[PDB]
Ligand binder design. Structure first.
Ligand SMILES: [Ca+2]
Length: 961
């Protein structure tokens, strides 16, 4: 099994597999055509030289290495390489006498496959031991984080610190280089993110240890919260280091990453369900609470936490959570409706809601069954495969209950091969046990839903249905905040899409699927999705413009409620309230940011970033509250002040970058319409505030207006650092500068009217300044041959389904006139050929290798011209994003060439294929999908970068809506 996770392996294994492609090409020229095989002497000598380098440095390594694992795993590579090497040399010797020798060609096709396998295994052992070093350092730091609790003296604090130094420095350097030596870009992203999180967590660590030790040397009263924050820091840092250790051992795409994410989100739904369980169960059972209240929604969103669990369990276990969720949802609806009319406390208002909520305690129990279930499934999954199967697979050459412990929790060297077979079987069952998941960014969800609604191939891609369900769930989440327009976007559109999709499902499983009765209804559902996208982005924009207007005043009031004088009144009466409003504000911001990441127009990178910052703030709120409680506890103490300032600054910066990333995910002109609407509404509350003599309300509204104007100044300065032309830098700046001109006059005029609230001239001055701000924001807004067909042939196909998904996606646009759609069409066609060639095996070797070479060539065309597109385009975000989709193309093309050469050395269906040939088909399929859809995203985003010269993206199909 070949590997490609580093640039050194690739730089070594690409020319090797290339010369091997030559040798198997001449092998086919010999075996299929009976042609003279020429002087293999020079090429075999070059191969055996470039490989004898690896063998030589390896043999020198095993002498001077203290690594025992290397001493075990390295000589077998020496044998697997030397054998095939000498075998190829022998083939070169025999084919000098008789260039038609039938056993000399047996030794030519066995050695090339053997030199590929052996070379890959040898490099894999090197790499493996190189990482084992890095993991040795990481485990060093992990063990050093456990001795953090023994520090009780400032002497122990400084000593602990200075000794922690060198290991941290060495780890950071090692990871910074290893990530630069990796080919899988996502792995690099994970290493960078984790190491950055640890490095950003060190100062918080020494701060928490500092307040712990100052609180310990003296007899201060903040000892508990201090150890809470310190133990939390050890927890988070140790967890991130463990993430580093897991990623470092990855040699392919993420295979078991879904497990940990699914189980941690699974537990997150419950850790979040606890609090709202208590609160909502406590203050709903009251005889009335006006609907739309935050305490009312406190149940309506609880069920949402169950839904995200129901979307994680497989399609069958969805039963309990889905049916219970629907019944609880409709019975609470009746609670709100009945309680908000002339009749409350008719037993239907008590006896129904009571049995229901007593059932809320039941669906809160059903979700833990699936949560415990799945985990035991992941802990058993990794415990069997990793801890016993590998460890005693190595030690096959005694003691027993390792293979017993693996064999019990599941349900010579060929016996271990059977162990690998059954392991793959268990991984198959585990993989099926979980349902397919829709994308997270919007266009992925609506694209999968789109691919299911128009041609529902019966009983596959429940990913489209899952995308519709995730979109409808996100529409329910966006709706709970509204009031009047609450019913029109929720009831009509969300339930209309749920109903319509239920019609296209019941109308496809129990009946016919291709009739126009299901295709005339499909357009009824295809545009409804567009409606939910439009109004969902609209309501999301309105919600963001309100919730994210002020992100810092609650924690500011909490900061001044902590430094209150000791003789101040109601110190905890106001403090606990500031912490309550601070936790509520933080959670509200987090939820709004989640909706923004789900519905907004932003690439998956910024979606993962928004979710990451929401995770971080959600983790940071309680420790900020506890820091406020160790400052409020000890007045005049400098250490508590430094700690609370550190924590509060952490929260401030995380919510700041959260505000920015969330702002990226919104159509900025729609945002300007939203904030302009908010300035219109704010001024009405000002006229009213004057009419009823409310100067505090007036200055509050004016400060809100100036706040929004400054925010618009931020989003306007953002468009300056994004455009590379003063076409935008005098239009945007020429308006934002005047918007900055209009700010302060409105403020001082507001302060003027606040003292004489009924003076018509003063009021007139203030209002004039305000509407001048309004017009300024308005100006800021105003500143903004022929073709081929797919060779589908009648009856492997999973490799062709990707080729179809690219061909059907490339043909949507221009035939020619742009080399990228020509090259992508040709790539999907050549992939339709390669799918036919993989299960071939009769003169298909040269056609398959030549096919991979063609795919790599067209890939170079796409990458080249797309890189040309990126540098003649405004807004650097689209350019850099396009480059991000472009860099993952040449790597996957090269890996496609090498894998193709392996499959070619095993393509003459001469038998060495217990499952070894089945592996190379699967790797070619995985690589084929990743390449395929990678150039698909490169095509779509390539057109996005062409709306900004260069290409012509005119569409093919004639306009018919
Ligand atoms: Ca003035």
């Amino acid at each position: 099994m070949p590997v490609f996770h580093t640039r050194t392996i690739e730089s070594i294994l690409e020319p090797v597999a290339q010369q091997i492609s030559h040798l198997v090409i001449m092998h086919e020229e010999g075996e299929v055509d009976g042609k003279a095989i020429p002087d293999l002497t020079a090429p075999v000598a070059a191969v055996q030289a470039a490989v004898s380098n690896l063998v030589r440095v390896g043999k020198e390594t095993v002498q001077t290495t203290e690594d025992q694992i290397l001493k075990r795993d390295m000589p077998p590579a020496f044998i697997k390489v030397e054998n095939a090497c000498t075998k190829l040399v022998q083939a070169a010797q025999m084919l000098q006498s008789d260039p038609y020798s039938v056993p000399a060609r047996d030794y030519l096709i066995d050695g090339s496959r053997g030199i590929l396998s052996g070379t890959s295994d040898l490099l894999l052992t090197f790499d493996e031991a190189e990482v084992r070093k890095i993991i040795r350092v990481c485990k060093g730091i992990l063990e050093y984080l456990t001795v953090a609790e023994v520090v009780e003296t400032m002497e122990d604090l400084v000593t602990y610190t200075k000794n922690l130094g060198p290991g941290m420095t060495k780890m950071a350097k090692m990871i910074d280089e290893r990530q630069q030596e990796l080919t899988h870009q996502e792995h690099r992203v994970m290493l960078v993110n984790s190491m950055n999180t640890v490095k950003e967590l060190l100062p918080v660590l020494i701060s928490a240890m500092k307040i712990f030790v100052t609180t310990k040397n003296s007899k201060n009263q903040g000892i508990e919260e201090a150890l809470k924050n310190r133990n939390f820091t050890v927890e988070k840092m140790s967890a991130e280091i463990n993430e580093i250790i897991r990623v470092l051992q990855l040699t392919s795409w993420d295979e078991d990453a879904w497990a940990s994410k699914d189980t941690e989100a699974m537990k997150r739904a419950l850790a979040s369900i606890d609090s709202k369980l208590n609160q909502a169960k406590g203050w709903l059972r009251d005889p009335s609470a006006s609907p739309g209240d935050a305490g009312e929604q406190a149940i309506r969103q609880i069920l949402d936490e169950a839904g995200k669990v129901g979307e994680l369990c497989a399609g069958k276990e969805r039963r309990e959570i889905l049916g219970t969720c629907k019944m609880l949802g409709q019975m609470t609806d009746q609670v709100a409706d009945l309680r908000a009319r002339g009749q409350g406390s008719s037993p239907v208002a008590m006896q129904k809601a009571q049995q229901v909520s007593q059932g809320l305690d039941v669906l809160t129990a059903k979700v833990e069954n699936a949560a415990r279930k799945l985990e035991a499934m992941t802990n058993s999954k990794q415990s069997i495969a990793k801890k016993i199967d590998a460890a005693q697979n190595w030690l096959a050459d005694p003691e027993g209950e390792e293979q017993i412990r693996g064999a019990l929790a599941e349900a010579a060297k060929q016996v271990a091969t059977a162990l690998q077979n059954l392991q793959t079987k268990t991984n198959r069952a585990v993989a099926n046990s979980r349902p397919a998941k829709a994308a997270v960014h919007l266009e992925g969800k609506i694209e999968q839903a789109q691919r299911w609604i128009d041609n529902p191939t019966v009983d596959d891609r429940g990913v489209g249905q899952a995308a519709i369900r995730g979109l409808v769930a996100e529409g329910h989440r966006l709706a709970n905040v509204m009031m009047g327009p609450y019913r029109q976007d929720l009831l009509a559109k969300c339930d209309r899409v749920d109903q319509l999709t239920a019609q296209l499902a019941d109308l496809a499983a129990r009946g016919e699927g291709e009739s126009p009765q299901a295709r005339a209804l499909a357009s009824q559902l295809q545009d409804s999705l567009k409606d939910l996208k439009a109004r969902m982005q609209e309501a999301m924009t309105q919600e963001v413009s309100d919730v994210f207007s002020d992100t810092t005043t609650p924690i500011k009031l909490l900061a001044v409620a902590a430094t209150a004088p000791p003789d101040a009144p109601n110190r905890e009466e106001v403090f606990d309230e500031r912490a309550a409003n601070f936790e509520n504000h933080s959670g509200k911001l987090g939820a709004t940011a989640e909706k923004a990441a789900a519905v907004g127009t932003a690439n998956k990178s910024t979606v993962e970033g928004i979710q990451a910052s929401v995770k971080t703030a959600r983790e940071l709120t309680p420790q900020v509250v506890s820091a406020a409680r160790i400052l409020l506890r000890n007045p005049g103490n400098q250490a508590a002040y430094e700690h609370f300032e550190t924590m509060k600054n952490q929260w401030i910066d995380n919510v700041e970058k959260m505000t920015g990333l969330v702002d990226e995910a919104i159509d900025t002109k729609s945002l300007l319409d939203a904030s302009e609407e908010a300035i219109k509404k704010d001024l009405d509350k000002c006229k009213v505030a004057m009419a009823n003599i409310q100067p505090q309300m007036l200055v509050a509204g004016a400060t809100s207006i100036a706040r929004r104007a400054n925010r618009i100044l931020l989003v306007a300065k953002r468009e300056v650092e994004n455009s590379e032309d003063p076409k935008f830098r005098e239009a945007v700046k020429a308006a934002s500068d005047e918007l900055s001109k209009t700010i302060s006059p409105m403020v001082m005029d507001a302060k003027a009217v606040a003292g004489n609230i009924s003076d018509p001239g003063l009021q007139k001055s203030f209002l004039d300044s305000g509407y001048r701000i309004l017009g300024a924001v308005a100006k800021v807004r105003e500143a903004f041959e022929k073709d081929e067909e797919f060779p589908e042939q009648k009856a492997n196909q999973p490799m062709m389904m990707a080729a179809r998904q690219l061909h059907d996606e490339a043909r949507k646009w221009s035939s020619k006139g742009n080399d990228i759609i020509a090259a992508a069409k040709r790539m999907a066609l050549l992939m339709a050929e390669m799918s036919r060639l993989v299960r071939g095996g009769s003169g298909t070797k040269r056609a398959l290798i030549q096919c991979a070479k063609d795919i790599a060539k067209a890939s170079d065309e796409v990458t080249r011209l797309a890189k040309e597109v990126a540098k003649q385009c405004t807004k650097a975000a689209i350019a850099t994003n396009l480059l991000q989709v472009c860099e993952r193309i040449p790597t996957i093309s090269t890996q496609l060439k090498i894998l193709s050469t392996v499959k070619a050395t095993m393509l003459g269906r001469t038998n060495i294929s217990d499952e070894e040939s089945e592996q190379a088909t699967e790797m070619l399929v995985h690589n084929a999908q990743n390449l395929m859809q990678s150039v698909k995203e490169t095509v779509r985003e390539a057109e996005a970068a062409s709306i900004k010269f260069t290409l012509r993206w005119v569409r093919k199909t004639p306009w018919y809506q």
